[PDB]
């Protein structure tokens, strides 16, 4: 069948500046002049949204920013002046013979100036107490780039053990990255430990960011 | 309004078999072909099936040959897939859509969208727990809060503040998967004046074990 291979798997495009995504089919799409090719966008749970259609061709009510080119094998998916709400994942489609297939997709990313993250660190619930659970969790918020590290220490001593971390993905609007660091302990290895202390390790800052809390 | 309704998720043991339903409304059902399309997270769109809903004519994939069963209701105008002995691999979302022929074949709609996992767990409903600072040194005008959604499957949950009075500020992270639990959290920033008088609410809701927790900070 005819497969496709995007590159490159991800891409980072400063707001103002053109995006350019490649699709290589296996073999020709073009029929009679006319390509069979569609650019679809999927944001972050929803379904993929059509973009260009016969690849030369803007849907009905998407911006005019969006565009493309190419023919054959080759083909383009270009979007100038790229916007804040342009970030998102995009695949490329081929419905010129069967089965239809689509490609491996490519994750599109804004480039902006770094930002430092907000740490907050909030103490185990008393219903977890109650129940004798402990969770202390720390979040981390509207931070670029995504590098980053969280530090868990317990009265001055480090615990890498039972710690889960989630990252965002970017804000559409904001373009920002968020997480989060979840210490889980049982009610026993919370009352035997005063200092719970949360630090981020981030490029601008010399230092990890301090934030705590006394039990 | 032309729209394909699907099914929020699916919970299926190992070795069992599951039937998915795309109700399609606002157009006619038989003057369109139904296709199905695979969605693993982090492999992309893989292409399922499709059939000709007026003399139920299929055709299907050589991978999910013999794997899936494609079949019709022409007078609920509801379209059915079967699959056959789900496996690890086959935990993922599945979309149902309307291809649009004109030249080459497109999709102008898609449907909700259905999560299938495949498990032999039960369904576990979530526990919500407030989260509250309880202390700072007014270094900051605002207040940021957060809540703790741990010890539920499957997927997924919605999380909303004060149901959903709040759509500033509130950051949304994937859960992480602990123990066959899955676990998540949410935050908010409000404003340092508006704590006081108003009161925060972490709404958490369940839609395959359809509950409902409301949990003051």
């Known amino acids: 069948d005819i497969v496709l291979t995007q590159s490159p798997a991800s891409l980072a495009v400063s707001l103002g500046q053109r995006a350019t995504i490649s699709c290589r089919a296996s073999?020709?799409?073009?029929?009679?002049?006319?390509?069979?090719m569609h650019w679809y966008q999927q944001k972050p749970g929803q379904p993929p949204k059509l973009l260009i259609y016969?690849?030369?061709s803007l849907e009905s009510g998407v911006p005019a920013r969006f565009s493309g080119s190419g023919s054959g094998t080759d083909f383009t998916l270009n979007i100038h002046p790229v916007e804040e709400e342009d970030a998102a994942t995009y695949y490329c489609?081929?419905?010129?013979?069967?089965?239809?297939?689509f490609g491996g997709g490519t994750k599109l990313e804004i480039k902006r100036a770094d930002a430092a993250p907000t740490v907050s660190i909030f103490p185990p619930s008393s219903e977890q107490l109650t129940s004798g659970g402990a969770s202390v969790v720390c979040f981390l918020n509207n931070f670029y780039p995504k590098d980053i590290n969280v530090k868990w220490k317990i009265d001055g001593s480090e615990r890498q053990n039972g710690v889960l971390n989630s990252w965002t993905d970017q804000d559409s609007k904001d373009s920002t990255y968020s997480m989060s660091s979840t210490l889980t302990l049982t009610k026993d290895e919370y009352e035997r430990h005063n200092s719970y202390t949360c630090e981020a390790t981030h490029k601008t800052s010399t230092s990890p960011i301090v934030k705590s809390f006394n039990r | 309004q032309v729209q394909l309704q699907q099914p929020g998720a699916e919970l299926v043991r190992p070795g069992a078999s599951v039937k998915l339903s795309c109700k399609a409304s606002?157009?006619?059902?038989?003057?369109?072909?139904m296709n199905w399309v695979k969605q693993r997270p982090g492999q992309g769109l893989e292409w399922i099936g499709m059939?000709?809903?007026?003399?139920?004519?299929?055709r299907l994939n050589q991978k999910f040959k013999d794997k899936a069963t494609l079949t019709v209701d022409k007078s609920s105008t509801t379209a059915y897939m079967q699959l056959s002995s789900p496996t690890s691999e086959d935990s993922a979302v599945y979309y149902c859509?309307?291809?649009?022929?004109?030249?080459?074949?497109?999709?102008?709609?898609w449907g909700q969208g259905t999560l299938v996992t495949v498990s032999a767990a039960k369904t576990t409903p979530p526990s919500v727990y407030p989260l509250a600072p309880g202390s700072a040194a007014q270094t900051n005008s605002m207040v940021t809060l957060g809540c703790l959604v741990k010890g539920y499957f499957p997927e997924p949950v919605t999380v909303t503040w004060n149901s959903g009075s709040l759509s500033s500020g509130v950051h949304t992270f994937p859960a992480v998967l602990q123990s066959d639990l899955y676990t998540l959290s949410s935050s908010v920033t409000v404003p340092s004046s508006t704590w006081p008088s108003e009161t925060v609410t972490c709404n958490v809701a369940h839609p395959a074990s359809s509950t409902k927790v409301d949990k003051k900070i």
């Open positions: 859509a309307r291809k649009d022929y004109d030249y080459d074949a497109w999709f102008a709609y």
């Open positions: 606002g157009y006619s059902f038989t003057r369109f072909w």
């Open positions: 059939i000709h809903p007026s003399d139920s004519e299929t």
């Open positions: 073999k020709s799409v073009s029929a009679s002049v006319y390509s069979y």
């Open positions: 016969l690849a030369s």
């Open positions: 489609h081929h419905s010129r013979e069967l089965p239809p297939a």
